[PDB]
């Protein structure tokens, strides 16, 4: 009679932890939902398979407006686990729903898994030298959202490097690519021409992270804006100054121009 | 021919990924290092038990000064691991390992854990609030080292939250306390006096990450600075003006007084 709060990881059913996976195997229902992110390397049939029960997808709607009507009933009886790719409450509003767990006399765990935000640090890019992180959101009708262009700029003014979580559609099936991302930064730049974000800016991408071949890249937008990083998800990255040993590992790692090996202390 | 940086995630040996074990379980060699960080809720013997693999320990000196002379070599004929605590590449240091490994016409691949990055979403606080992070050392001799307290108020500066990692003597098995850290930065803000750490603080103690029961409390550092947390290792973290729904799940999951409701919001 608790719930659990499970992490599958970044790419496939095998980025779960093995604690997460024994305890799992052990819940007498099993829900999940894959709105938050993209595990772009397993299907729901192999986590189904790995961990020997039948898992059934909730939708944004059933967890944000129906999670104490479809899970927690069960949770106050039975053992439930709920799944999520990566970590389940990083830059998802998950953790909110321990407060409901909590409100309807209900104990829950939280098993943690490998998420992009630790995993940035496969780029070579110090991560305590990253700042506030964004969300590059898709425009939808008229309304243009901006707030990420700012963001950058406040790290860059620091030093600070940014971390770009891209945007997700689910039921459309749309995962915005660094592609994507780029231009529509390039658009904001030339409405707010801050000097942020142009043609040479130095970015970083890191696609499908968790994957033995995950992709990874770094150089200047205007030669980046085109090049294909494989099939989602994708994060961009935009630097702040970088130390020597990032430069080099960017260069070495990533491919970038070995021209950012000069910095401009 | 092929070198696996392998994570092991936050607490015990489960923390590790399905992925991690069974790549660990088929390497010819493996290796890691408890420098950077131990893994308090378990043993070298339980690790090296679950992995059935004999685990040789290699020291900070071993690492930085010799990789390419003890843990490569290796790696040319055979399948080589080498296990760090949490996520692989957050130590800063780590990621120019794969550039040695590269110059020494070795493969690397890097397989994904946990990390106290991520895990500290367990507190409730939005991941992409986090500003720069940092370190509270001890003070030692005529050397009063005092760059955190800027970072922190640089960070709250703009609302930003600060994860504080403690210094810890690993050889020794020395670990800073939660409680160790607020008197410091008391003394230190008596020293600078900014108005960034004072007795009207609010700050959020994480303990024991990724254990089933992990100790989290939020309170004003009056009432914390001699709070027992339990045993290490302790994280320490310095919100900016909080987010409502982020109040009140420390007040609801971490045993926030009411109070922050209305100040810290
Ligand atoms: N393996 C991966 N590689 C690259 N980007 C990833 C990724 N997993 C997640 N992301 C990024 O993060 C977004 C989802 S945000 C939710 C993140 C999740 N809780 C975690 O802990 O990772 C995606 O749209 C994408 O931009």
Chains 1, 2 share one sequence.
Not at 80 to 99: K, N
Not at 148 to 174: P, Q, S, W
Request: with cysteine.
């Amino acid at each position: 009679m608790v719930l659990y709060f499970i992490g599958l990881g970044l790419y496939d059913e095998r980025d779960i932890t093995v604690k997460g996976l024994m305890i799992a195997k052990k819940c007498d229902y099993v829900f999940a939902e894959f709105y938050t992110s993209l595990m772009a390397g397993t299907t729901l049939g192999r986590i189904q398979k790995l961990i020997g029960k039948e898992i059934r997808v909730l939708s944004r709607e059933d967890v944000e407006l129906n999670f104490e009507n479809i899970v927690l009933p069960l949770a106050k009886e039975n053992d439930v686990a709920f799944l999520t790719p990566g970590d389940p409450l990083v830059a998802t509003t998950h953790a909110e729903l321990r407060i409901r767990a909590k409100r309807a006399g209900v104990e829950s765990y939280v098993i943690h898994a490998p998420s992009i935000y630790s995993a940035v640090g496969i780029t070579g890019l110090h991560i305590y030298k990253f700042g506030k992180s964004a969300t590059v959101a898709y425009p939808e009708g008229n309304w243009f959202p901006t707030s990420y262009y700012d963001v950058i700029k406040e790290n860059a003014e620091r030093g600070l490097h940014t971390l770009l979580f891209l945007d997700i559609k689910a039921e459309k099936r749309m995962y915005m690519t660094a592609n994507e991302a780029m231009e529509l930064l390039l658009k904001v730049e030339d409405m707010k021409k801050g000097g942020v974000f142009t043609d040479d800016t130095l970015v970083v991408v890191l696609a499908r992270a968790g994957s033995l071949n995950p992709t990874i890249r770094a150089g200047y937008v205007k030669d980046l804006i085109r090049e294909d990083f494989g099939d989602p998800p994708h994060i961009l990255i935009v630097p702040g100054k970088l130390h020597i040993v990032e430069a080099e590992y960017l260069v070495e790692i990533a491919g970038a121009p070995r021209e950012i090996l000069r910095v401009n202390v």
